[PDB]
Amino acid sequence: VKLMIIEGEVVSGLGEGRYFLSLPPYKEIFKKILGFEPYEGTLNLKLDREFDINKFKYIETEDFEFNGKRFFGVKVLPIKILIGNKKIDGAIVVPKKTYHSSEIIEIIAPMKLREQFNLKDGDVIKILIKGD
Ligand SMILES: [Cl-]
Ligand SMILES: [Cl-]
Ligand SMILES: [Zn+2]
């Protein structure tokens, strides 16, 4: 059981509220794949080094056709979000296009962690990959 604890600083990204948090196929598939409807948003962390999902066993969702538009699937890597004593299930998400640096990861969880744990930017958490 090869684990991986990684530390990251809560920051804010762009979060147009993004097709893949917002459309039912994505909803339903995260339900399949991760077993939760993720909260419609992402907690972005700044890591101490670059991060590469490909260096892991990621699920890659399929592209969808939704109301005439095509939508690209997303690479998701499941994780445990470690906030103080509590230790939530979540995933690192990587869509097709992303303007941010490789040292930023996005975390999705079943609820908005920001609010549910009153996090501010600058705060640090640990997350737990259990992969490599
Ligand atoms: Cl954000
Ligand atoms: Cl969040
Ligand atoms: Zn970005």
Side-chain angles (χ1 to χ4, degrees), residues 12-15 18 44 98-101 104 106:
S12 307
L14 11 186
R18 245 125 92 239
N44 314 35
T98 219
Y99 298 174
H100 58 234
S101 89
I104 278 68
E106 298 191 80

Short mmCIF file of all heavy atoms in Angstrom, two decimals, residues 12-15 18 44 97-101 104 106, ligand 3, unseen atoms left out:
data_model
loop_
_atom_site.label_atom_id
_atom_site.label_comp_id
_atom_site.label_asym_id
_atom_site.label_seq_id
_atom_site.Cartn_x
_atom_site.Cartn_y
_atom_site.Cartn_z
N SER A 12 -6.97 30.56 -4.86
CA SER A 12 -8.13 30.66 -5.73
C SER A 12 -7.72 30.57 -7.22
O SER A 12 -6.74 31.19 -7.65
CB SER A 12 -8.89 31.96 -5.45
OG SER A 12 -9.19 32.10 -4.07
N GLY A 13 -8.47 29.80 -8.00
CA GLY A 13 -8.31 29.82 -9.44
C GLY A 13 -9.53 30.40 -10.12
O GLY A 13 -10.45 30.89 -9.46
N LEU A 14 -9.52 30.35 -11.45
CA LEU A 14 -10.71 30.61 -12.28
C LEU A 14 -11.59 29.35 -12.29
O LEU A 14 -11.14 28.20 -12.27
CB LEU A 14 -10.38 31.10 -13.70
CG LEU A 14 -8.94 31.04 -14.24
CD1 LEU A 14 -8.86 31.71 -15.60
CD2 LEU A 14 -7.97 31.72 -13.30
N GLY A 15 -12.88 29.60 -12.30
CA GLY A 15 -13.83 28.64 -11.79
C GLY A 15 -15.09 29.16 -12.40
O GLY A 15 -16.06 29.52 -11.71
N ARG A 18 -17.88 25.02 -14.29
CA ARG A 18 -17.25 24.58 -15.48
C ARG A 18 -18.07 23.40 -15.89
O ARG A 18 -18.54 22.64 -15.04
CB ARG A 18 -15.80 24.26 -15.14
CG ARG A 18 -14.81 25.16 -15.85
CD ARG A 18 -13.85 25.87 -14.89
NE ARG A 18 -12.61 25.13 -14.69
CZ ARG A 18 -12.14 24.68 -13.52
NH1 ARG A 18 -12.78 24.89 -12.37
NH2 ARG A 18 -11.00 24.02 -13.50
N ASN A 44 -8.51 24.82 -5.02
CA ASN A 44 -7.24 24.79 -5.72
C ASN A 44 -6.11 24.89 -4.72
O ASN A 44 -6.12 25.74 -3.85
CB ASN A 44 -7.14 25.96 -6.69
CG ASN A 44 -8.38 26.14 -7.53
OD1 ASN A 44 -9.50 25.91 -7.06
ND2 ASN A 44 -8.21 26.54 -8.77
N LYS A 97 -8.22 21.70 -20.94
CA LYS A 97 -7.57 23.03 -20.95
C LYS A 97 -7.50 23.61 -19.53
O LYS A 97 -8.43 23.49 -18.75
CB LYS A 97 -8.36 24.00 -21.85
CG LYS A 97 -7.95 25.50 -21.77
N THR A 98 -6.37 24.25 -19.22
CA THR A 98 -6.16 24.82 -17.90
C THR A 98 -5.04 25.86 -17.99
O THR A 98 -3.92 25.53 -18.40
CB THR A 98 -5.77 23.73 -16.90
OG1 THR A 98 -6.41 24.00 -15.65
CG2 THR A 98 -4.23 23.61 -16.72
N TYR A 99 -5.34 27.11 -17.64
CA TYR A 99 -4.33 28.17 -17.78
C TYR A 99 -3.33 28.16 -16.64
O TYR A 99 -2.36 28.89 -16.69
CB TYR A 99 -4.93 29.59 -17.91
CG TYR A 99 -5.82 29.86 -19.12
CD1 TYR A 99 -6.49 31.10 -19.24
CD2 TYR A 99 -6.01 28.92 -20.15
CE1 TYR A 99 -7.33 31.39 -20.33
CE2 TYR A 99 -6.86 29.19 -21.25
CZ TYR A 99 -7.52 30.44 -21.34
OH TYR A 99 -8.36 30.75 -22.41
N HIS A 100 -3.52 27.33 -15.62
CA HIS A 100 -2.64 27.40 -14.47
C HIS A 100 -1.45 26.50 -14.57
O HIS A 100 -1.37 25.61 -15.41
CB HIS A 100 -3.36 27.20 -13.13
CG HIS A 100 -4.09 25.90 -13.00
ND1 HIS A 100 -5.42 25.83 -12.66
CD2 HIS A 100 -3.67 24.62 -13.12
CE1 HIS A 100 -5.80 24.57 -12.61
NE2 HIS A 100 -4.75 23.81 -12.89
N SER A 101 -0.52 26.78 -13.67
CA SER A 101 0.73 26.07 -13.60
C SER A 101 0.54 24.68 -13.04
O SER A 101 -0.46 24.35 -12.41
CB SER A 101 1.72 26.83 -12.71
OG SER A 101 1.60 26.44 -11.35
N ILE A 104 -0.24 23.78 -9.40
CA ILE A 104 -1.57 23.92 -8.87
C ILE A 104 -2.33 22.65 -9.19
O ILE A 104 -2.32 22.18 -10.31
CB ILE A 104 -2.31 25.18 -9.44
CG1 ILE A 104 -1.91 26.42 -8.67
CG2 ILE A 104 -3.82 25.07 -9.29
CD1 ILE A 104 -0.51 26.82 -8.88
N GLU A 106 -6.35 20.84 -8.49
CA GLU A 106 -7.73 21.13 -8.12
C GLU A 106 -8.31 19.93 -7.46
O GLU A 106 -8.11 18.81 -7.91
CB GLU A 106 -8.56 21.45 -9.34
CG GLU A 106 -8.08 22.68 -10.07
CD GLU A 106 -9.06 23.12 -11.12
OE1 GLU A 106 -10.07 23.79 -10.76
OE2 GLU A 106 -8.84 22.78 -12.30
ZN ZN B 3 -5.98 27.72 -13.91
#
